[PDB]
RNA sequence: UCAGAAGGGAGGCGAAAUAGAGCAUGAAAUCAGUUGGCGAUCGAGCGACAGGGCAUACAAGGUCCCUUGACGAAUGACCGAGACGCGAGUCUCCAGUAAGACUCACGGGAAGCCGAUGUUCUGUCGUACGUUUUGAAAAACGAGCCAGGGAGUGUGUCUGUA
RNA sequence: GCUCUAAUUGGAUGGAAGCAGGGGCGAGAGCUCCUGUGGACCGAUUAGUGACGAAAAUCCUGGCCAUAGUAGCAGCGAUAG
């Protein structure tokens, strides 16, 4: 009696040397939180980013320590942008037909939360057979 | 007070310039060393006795309800002089400062060492005062 | 109202509640704090002394202007809130009775959990000068008690 | 006429209150008021063809 | 059980009673109890960024440490030898050498482990926000807090544009 | 990013929306997954539609904390037990 995930959970994509380097860079450099100015000072102000507009705003004026402001210089490398940490490109899947055309070498599949257990069971078996990792696998009871 | 301080360094302030010693004792204490300054009463301040005395008298004089508590005795004065060379409100600063103690006379068995650059030549100088003298003028009880 | 906020083993524990009591919530908080960990019987004896004025209840939170009391230990302010105390005595009488009916020894059981909760206000208005009225309100208090065998 | 049927008036300065039309101590008519009018509502005269 | 048609306990119904009567769901402000972190010698835009400590069920992230080696931009030596300077020191050669951020490979290691999250500590920077203003942290104006509400719309005509 | 319309096309009692806590992506607006709760609805693409996005207006309404167990429950030629 132990929990085990369905499918190929250890599968990793094959990446060109330069893509793996850029993936490593993205992970290494990261980025600031880019939370809205003073969101921590007022409960009614949430973290969702808004450009500081105040004429006198310290953050708008670029005062060191008031947080970076969103700017294009902060974008991730083109080659790797949007990749799952594993390096796979994600493909969203609502059913069995959605698996068609998916390359399990460069792509992993994410089953939409709305999809129920019955349809999930079928999607997961077909995906394994096609050599495609499921990022959000069911965990089933199996022996120790 | 009589507590038997264990010092990595014992400094003899006899015929030495207070601020030049203090500057060096400050830096050593921040460097991790425990320091005992010895014979504080015989430590020395260059210049005209009358203006020197006015300055220290002004410090005894100034104050209010919040309070400015300025030491009259030679050990106290030396201690305070050192505190001024430490970030004594920050943690590393208060730690260094508490690793320093100043003594009237020499409670140790061994003579202290004379730090380079701190020694005053009495044959070359008549304009200076001993801490002991300042304290007596300030009205300190002379226990040394 | 409240539900029990702590889990309790039916076999080793007994339960009781007060509902919507009109009495100081602040006094109730102070009393709960003080009787937790006591034996049911101990708590009863304590509260009766409070009612007599022999035992102060420490007020550690709602202390404004409250005079110091020599019998308070490790603290200064205390008082003798008999009304809330009487209600806690009702709470304990129920709990210990429930316990006895289950075959425990009621008085000897430890108070594992005791907590007061302000569940509402009974609302009133007080006419003031200059043609205005202002709130004159009654707190409403639930309190949960879980007795547990030693 | 939704939100406009009321002779609510503002007290102006001096009560420590914003200048907002009130009737029987409740704000009325202005678009920031609950029960107030819709500032720029859908209109029948609009040509939708 | 209780002064009790109250309330409580136990129990019954139902898929569900945390559907038990203003009873679907049940946010925030906020309250009680409790958990983690800090804590009665210490300083205040509450943080950003970097780095420590303590804390962490699974899932949805899987990385990370150390020795050695490969590659190696800008930059770039010690010591030693020769020569110069009153002196601090400098020049020439060793040498664009050793070193040099990232990345990778072999071997070894970590599973509260790496990330991340909570809290706290250290470093650097930092006197909110919005508005008025030549100049706002302002002893200029506004808000107790939170939720919800709250401001370029229609007709006609004219003039451009795609 | 929000509403509702249309065409094309999907998900849901083998558990939709919402909510709480958490994981991943995006410079970001925001997208998405897991767990719990919930117990019936929900999307995507394209072309439309508009009562479409709030930290502020002594803004509106409702709820709520501190204030605080504080002021008052004394004062009056009727001090009443
Ligand atoms: Cl872009
Ligand atoms: Cl003083
Ligand atoms: Cl300091
Ligand atoms: Cl001289
Ligand atoms: Cl209260
Ligand atoms: Cl209290
Ligand atoms: Cl690289
Ligand atoms: Cl290699
Ligand atoms: Cl506009
Ligand atoms: Mg972010
Ligand atoms: Mg906030
Ligand atoms: Mg699902
Ligand atoms: Mg799933
Ligand atoms: Mg008082
Ligand atoms: Mg009147
Ligand atoms: Mg209306
Ligand atoms: Mg409900
Ligand atoms: Mg302490
Ligand atoms: Mg002016
Ligand atoms: Mg809104
Ligand atoms: Mg389509
Ligand atoms: Mg604004
Ligand atoms: Mg209000
Ligand atoms: Mg007061
Ligand atoms: Mg009388
Ligand atoms: Na001097
Ligand atoms: Na003084
Ligand atoms: Na208090
Ligand atoms: Na005491
Ligand atoms: Na005492
Ligand atoms: Na009317
Ligand atoms: Na029309
Ligand atoms: Na930390
Ligand atoms: Na203004
Ligand atoms: Na301002
Ligand atoms: Na000012
Ligand atoms: Na108020
Ligand atoms: Na609007
Ligand atoms: Na107001």
Swiss-Prot record, chain A:
Bias type Basic and acidic residues, positions: 8-21
GO BP annotations, alphabetical order: DNA repair; translation
Biased composition, class Basic residues, residue ranges: 38-64
Keywords for the protein's UniProt record, in alphabetical order: Ribonucleoprotein, Ribosomal protein, RNA-binding, rRNA-binding
Chain segments carrying region Disordered: 1-87
UniProt key word Lyase: no
GO MF, one annotated term: DNA binding
GO cellular component terms listed in the entry, alphabetical order: cytosolic large ribosomal subunit
Role, per record: Binds to the 23S rRNA.
Family: Belongs to the eukaryotic ribosomal protein eL32 family.
Quaternary context: Part of the 50S ribosomal subunit. Interacts weakly with protein L15.
Protein name per UniProt: Large ribosomal subunit protein eL32
Source species: Haloarcula marismortui (strain ATCC 43049 / DSM 3752 / JCM 8966 / VKM B-1809) (Halobacterium marismortui)
Range within the parent protein: 96 to 239 of 241
Swiss-Prot record, chain B:
Residue pairs linked by disulfide bridges in the UniProt entry: none
PROSITE patterns linked: RIBOSOMAL_L13
GO molecular function: mRNA binding; rRNA binding; structural constituent of ribosome
Keyword rRNA-binding tagged: yes
Pfam families per record: Ribosomal_L13
GO BP terms, alphabetized: negative regulation of translation; translation
Any one annotated GO CC term: cytosolic large ribosomal subunit
Gene3D superfamilies referenced in this protein's UniProt entry, alphabetically: Ribosomal protein L13 (3.90.1180.10)
Keywords from the UniProt entry: Ribonucleoprotein, Ribosomal protein, RNA-binding, rRNA-binding
Family as reported in the entry's similarity comment: Belongs to the universal ribosomal protein uL13 family.
Subunit-structure text: Part of the 50S ribosomal subunit. Interacts weakly with proteins L3 and L6.
Job of this protein: This protein is one of the early assembly proteins of the 50S ribosomal subunit. Binds to 23S rRNA.
Xref: NCBIfam families: L13_A_E, PRK06394.1
Protein name per the record: Large ribosomal subunit protein uL13
Native source organism of the sequence: Haloarcula marismortui (strain ATCC 43049 / DSM 3752 / JCM 8966 / VKM B-1809) (Halobacterium marismortui)
UniProtKB/Swiss-Prot annotation, chain C:
A single BP term in Gene Ontology: cytoplasmic translation
Superkingdom of this protein's organism: Archaea
Keyword Transmembrane helix appears in the UniProt entry: no
InterPro entries: Ribosomal_uL22, Ribosomal_uL22_CS, Ribosomal_uL22_euk/arc, Ribosomal_uL22_sf
Keyword Heme included in the entry's annotation: no
GO molecular function, one term: structural constituent of ribosome
Gene Ontology cellular component annotations, sorted alphabetically: cytosolic large ribosomal subunit
Keywords: Ribonucleoprotein, Ribosomal protein, RNA-binding, rRNA-binding
Disulfide bridge partners, by residue number: none
Subunit structure: Part of the 50S ribosomal subunit. Contacts the macrolide antibiotic tylosin in the polypeptide exit tunnel.
Function, as annotated: This protein binds specifically to 23S rRNA. It makes multiple contacts with different domains of the 23S rRNA in the assembled 50S subunit and ribosome.
Family, similarity comment: Belongs to the universal ribosomal protein uL22 family.
The protein, known as: Large ribosomal subunit protein uL22
The species this protein was found in: Haloarcula marismortui (strain ATCC 43049 / DSM 3752 / JCM 8966 / VKM B-1809) (Halobacterium marismortui)
Gene behind this protein: rpl22
From Swiss-Prot, chain D:
Superkingdom of the source species: Archaea
Region (Disordered): 1-49
Bias (Basic and acidic residues) ranges: 42-49
Cited function: One of the primary rRNA binding proteins, this protein initially binds near the 5'-end of the 23S rRNA. It is important during the early stages of 50S assembly.
Subunit (UniProt): Part of the 50S ribosomal subunit. Interacts weakly with proteins L18e, L24 and L37e. Has been cross-linked to L18e.
Similarity comment: family membership: Belongs to the universal ribosomal protein uL4 family.
Name of the protein this chain belongs to: Large ribosomal subunit protein uL4
Species: Haloarcula marismortui (strain ATCC 43049 / DSM 3752 / JCM 8966 / VKM B-1809) (Halobacterium marismortui)
Source organism phylogeny: Archaea, Methanobacteriati, Methanobacteriota, Stenosarchaea group, Halobacteria
């Amino acid at each position: 009696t132990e929990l085990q995930a369905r499918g190929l959970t250890e599968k990793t994509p094959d990446l060109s040397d330069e893509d793996a380097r850029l993936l490593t860079q993205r992970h290494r450099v990261g980025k600031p939180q880019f939370n809205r100015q003073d969101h921590h000072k007022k409960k009614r102000v949430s973290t969702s980013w808004r450009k500081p507009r105040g004429q006198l705003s310290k953050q708008r004026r670029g005062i060191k320590g008031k947080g970076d402001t969103v700017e294009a210089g902060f974008r991730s490398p083109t080659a790797v942008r949007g990749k799952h940490p594993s390096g796979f490109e994600e493909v969203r899947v609502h059913n069995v037909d959605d698996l068609e055309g998916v390359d399990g070498d460069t792509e992993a599949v994410r089953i939409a939360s709305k999809v129920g257990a019955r349809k999930r069971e079928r999607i997961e078996e077909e995906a394994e057979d096609a050599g495609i990792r499921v990022l959000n696998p069911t965990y089933v009871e199996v022996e120790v | 007070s009589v507590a038997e301080f264990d010092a990595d360094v014992i400094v003899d302030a006899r015929d030495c310039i207070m601020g030049r010693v203090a500057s060096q004792v400050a830096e050593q204490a921040l460097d991790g060393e425990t320091v005992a300054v010895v014979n504080a009463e015989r430590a020395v301040i260059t210049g005209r006795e009358e203006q020197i005395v006015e300055k220290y008298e002004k410090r005894v004089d100034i104050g209010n309800d919040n309070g400015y508590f300025y030491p009259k005795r030679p050990d106290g004065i030396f201690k305070r002089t050192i505190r001024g060379m430490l970030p004594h409100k920050k943690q590393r600063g208060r730690e260094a400062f508490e690793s320093v103690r100043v003594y009237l006379g020499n409670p140790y068995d061994e003579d202290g060492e004379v730090l380079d650059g701190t020694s005053l030549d009495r044959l070359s100088n008549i304009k200076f005062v001993t801490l002991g003298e300042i304290s007596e003028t300030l009205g300190a009880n002379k226990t040394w | 109202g409240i539900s029990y906020s702590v889990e309790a083993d039916p076999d080793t524990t007994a339960k009781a509640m007060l509902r919507e009591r009109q009495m100081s919530f602040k006094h109730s908080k102070a009393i709960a704090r003080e009787i937790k960990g006591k034996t049911a019987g101990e708590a009863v004896d304590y509260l009766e002394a409070v009612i007599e004025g022999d035992q102060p209840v420490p007020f550690k939170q709602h202390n404004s202007g409250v005079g110091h009391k020599s019998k308070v230990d490790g603290w200064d302010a205390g008082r003798y809130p008999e009304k809330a105390s009487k209600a806690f005595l009702d709470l304990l009488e129920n709990a210990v009775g429930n316990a006895d009916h289950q075959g425990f020894d009621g008085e000897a059981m430890t108070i594992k959990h005791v907590a007061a909760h302000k569940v509402g206000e009974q609302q009133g208005r007080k006419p003031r000068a200059m043609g205005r009225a202002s709130a004159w309100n009654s707190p409403q208090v639930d309190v949960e008690l879980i007795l547990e065998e030693p | 006429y939704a939100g406009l049927r009321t002779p609510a008036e503002s007290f102006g300065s001096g009560r420590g209150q914003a200048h907002v039309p009130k009737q029987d101590g409740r704000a009325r008519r202005v678009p920031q008021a609950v029960k107030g009018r819709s500032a720029h509502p859908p209109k029948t005269e609009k040509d939708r063809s």
